[PDB]
Amino acid sequence: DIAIDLGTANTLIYQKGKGIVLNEPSVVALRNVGGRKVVHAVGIEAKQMLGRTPGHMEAIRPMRDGVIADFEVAEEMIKYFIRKVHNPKVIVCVPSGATAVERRAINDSCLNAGARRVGLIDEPMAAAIGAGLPIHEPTGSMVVDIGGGTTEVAVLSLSGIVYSRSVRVGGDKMDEAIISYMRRHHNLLIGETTAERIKKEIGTARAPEGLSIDVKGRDLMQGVPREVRISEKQAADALAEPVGQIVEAVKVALEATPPELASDIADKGIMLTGGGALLRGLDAEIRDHTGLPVTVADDPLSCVALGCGKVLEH
Ligand SMILES: Nc1ncnc2c1ncn2[C@@H]1O[C@H](COP(=O)(O)OP(=O)(O)NP(=O)(O)O)[C@@H](O)[C@H]1O
Ligand SMILES: [Mg+2]
Numbered sequence: 001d002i003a004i005d006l007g008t009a010n011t012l013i014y015q016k017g018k019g020i021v022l023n024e025p026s027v028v029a030l031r032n033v034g035g036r037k038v039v040h041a042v043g044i045e046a047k048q049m050l051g052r053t054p055g056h057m058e059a060i061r062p063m064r065d066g067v068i069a070d071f072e073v074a075e076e077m078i079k080y081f082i083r084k085v086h087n088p089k090v091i092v093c094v095p096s097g098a099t100a101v102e103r104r105a106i107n108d109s110c111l112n113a114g115a116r117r118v119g120l121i122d123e124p125m126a127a128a129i130g131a132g133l134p135i136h137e138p139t140g141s142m143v144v145d146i147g148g149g150t151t152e153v154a155v156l157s158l159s160g161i162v163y164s165r166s167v168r169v170g171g172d173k174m175d176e177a178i179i180s181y182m183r184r185h186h187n188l189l190i191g192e193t194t195a196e197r198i199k200k201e202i203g204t205a206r207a208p209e210g211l212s213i214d215v216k217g218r219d220l221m222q223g224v225p226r227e228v229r230i231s232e233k234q235a236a237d238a239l240a241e242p243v244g245q246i247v248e249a250v251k252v253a254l255e256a257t258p259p260e261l262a263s264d265i266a267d268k269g270i271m272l273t274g275g276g277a278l279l280r281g282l283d284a285e286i287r288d289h290t291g292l293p294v295t296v297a298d299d300p301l302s303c304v305a306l307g308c309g310k311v312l313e314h
Contacts, residue, residue, distance in 0.1 A: 001088045003308035009148035013085050014309035021085050026063050028077050031054045042080040051191035065168050066095040066150035067102040090115040093304050094120040095150045097166025124154035124164055127273040130307030131297035135265035139263030146276025148172050151246050153253040163256045169245040171276050174199050181238035186228050189293045190217035205243045205285040207236040247289050269293025273303040
């Protein structure tokens with residue numbers, strides 16, 4: 001009786017008639033204890049451990065690039081979360097491009113985690129539903145859902161997918177571009193938590209030098225902590241490659257769209273969902289390159305889960 005948005009960054013569970021009852025980082029901490037590995041923390045508590053664990057301890061993200069990588073740890077993650085909210089029927093989101101291998105792994109791990117039955121829903125369909133798009137109508141709707149692992153672009157109509165594609169670019173690749181930028185341009189080593197803070201605070205899809213923030217890491221030359229100031233322009237330059245990928249995926253989708261649906265999209269524009277939809281200026285950038293209106297869904301982190309939930313209610 002539940003819907004699971006199983007994401008690289010965040011897992012949400014919608015329960016029938018209750019709405020979203022769990023919203024937690026997709027993180028599992030394991031603790032070494034006599035050669036054996038026990039689950040130590042899952043969720044919010046484990047996320048705060050990333051880049052900060054002592055020797056006996058490991059913080060893991062078992063979902064990468066939109067799909068299950070480490071199946072044993074993902075199963076423990078799903079079990080933990082399903083237990084926390086309580087045999088149910090489950091529907092789970094999956095990237096539209098997920099291969100047959102990747103889909104069977106979600107299915108098996110949910111079955112292994114407790115599910116009686118499992119249905120898979122394509123992420124951009126869920127995202128569109130949850131962002132309030134009229135996906136059941138004979139009209140073209142286009143959604144772009146930018147997560148931590150993948151960016152999903154789709155055109156939907158009549159309760160189905162007209163076009164869809166998953167590209168392996170999103171928030172994680174953005175963080176990695178920022179880490180690489182700090183190393184190459186400032187000879188400073190920063191971690192994933194600092195990179196994500198940069199991205200959220202001054203990260204943007206188009207150069208303005210603009211605002212700035214101070215971050216800390218390890219100075220590579222001196223081997224001591226050092227504080228560096230980074231500007232919106234530098235963050236813009238670091239993010240230019242992944243942002244350009246997302247934009248090209250949108251253009252590719254538009255070229256594949258049947259002309260009457262293209263006509264519909266010209267009116268309605270494009271809807272952005274997912275945590276990556278909050279990247280400053282991403283809406284304007286897509287607008288510039290396509291000619292179309294671009295709207296950011298309200299609370300885009302939760303569109304997929306609300307979409308899966310509405311399916312549960314019908
Ligand atoms: N304000 C922000 N600006 C830029 N990026 C953001 C912002 N807020 C969150 N993010 C990113 O959004 C991502 C999380 O979004 P989310 O939609 O939950 O992805 P997901 O479902 O967990 N991953 P996926 O499996 O690829 O769909 C992370 O990479 C965040 O860093
Ligand atoms: Mg997602």
